[PDB]
Symmetry: C2
Subunit: 211 residues, 2 copies
């Protein structure tokens, strides 16, 4: 299923895109309508076999350990749509893909926010309940806040070009959110609690750079 939040960041002029976790290839198929050549990587065979008939090149494999059958500087964009939190070493994976990105190409990543009020309220209630879907999806094994997203990309030698915030309804939580913000201010806990606890996911464009 496409993340509609990602498609709006796809540039029509891109020539080559790599979709990491391409599933059955629906996002790539959409991108291909622009003429862009789309490569995908998928770990589940049934999905990878569907993607093979839609995309230009598909690997059935694990990004964390696979050989990379691409040219240096092949890709305008490498997409991590709701992937990084499923990997054991996401930090290593973003460095691994870097040589395959063009000069001034980008990573486009959608990353769930662990500081979202829907995780923080139950945690205060004494719960960390894994679910079929959502922020505590049972297949999620890594967690990130915005600060940690920024650190991850910056330390891998990417610069942050764009940040898009995806919000969900949180009207019921507002009073709780305002009281918690009072405690952060009082206790000098960070900055941006209010701006960040309402963000469900971040879409980040990170441009290839150096340290």
């Amino acid at each position: 299923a496409v993340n509609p939040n990602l498609l709006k960041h796809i540039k029509k002029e891109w020539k080559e895109v790599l979709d990491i976790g391409c599933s059955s290839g629906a996002l790539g198929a959409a991108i291909k309508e622009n003429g862009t050549r789309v490569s995908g990587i998928e770990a589940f065979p049934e999905a990878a076999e569907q993607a093979k008939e839609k995309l230009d090149h598909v690997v059935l494999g694990d990004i964390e350990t696979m050989d990379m059958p691409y040219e240096e500087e092949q890709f305008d964009c490498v997409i991590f749509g709701d992937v990084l939190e499923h990997l054991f070493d996401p930090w290593a994976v973003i460095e691994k893909v870097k040589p395959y990105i063009k000069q001034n190409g980008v990573i486009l990543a959608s990353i769930p926010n662990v500081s979202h009020i829907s995780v923080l309220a139950p945690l205060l209630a004494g719960n960390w309940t894994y679910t079929e879907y959502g922020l505590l999806d049972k297949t999620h094994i890594r967690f990130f806040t915005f600060n940690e997203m920024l650190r991850m990309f910056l330390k891998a030698g990417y610069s942050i070009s764009k940040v898009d915030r995806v919000y969900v309804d949180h009207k019921m939580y507002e009073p709780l959110i305002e009281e918690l913000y009072g405690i952060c201010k009082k206790y000098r806990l960070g900055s941006g609690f209010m701006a960040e606890t309402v963000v469900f996911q971040y879409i980040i464009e990170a441009e290839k750079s150096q340290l």
Copy 2:
């Protein structure tokens, strides 16, 4: 390195113990001083080779996927000392070991608490920072609160026989803790916030049972 919090729960009268993540075998070696036969499982070869000269039986392998070379009802106790949070499917692993536990035998597990103030305060500050050691150890891929520990064991058909709470210094956090407790009471968020956010780890004895 031994967890000194575990050794006090070892019964001298036990005849057979399985140490899951036995490392170099130091905990097992201590248990053996009682005459108890100790089996260990370790995933890192260098450690497993040291353990082999100390314990009665050692497997180099991954508990999640290995065949189990033990008899049914072999073990008085299966120890998970600071293991469960490192596994991809800890829920499945506790069911997997169950047939190898004696009637009225136990699992003894030490499990870090994600609701500890040292995780919750930085999370409010906008951080989820993985570390070399501690609650957000970079090799930790699962997180639990006390409620979730209880659910995990109960749903696998164990009964909870004993719970030991391991505390660390938190004097600097007390005012923050008291204010947060006020918010939980006000917002009807669970129960036991104050009792639980000061617990760094839990040691749980779970007795073999049924649903």
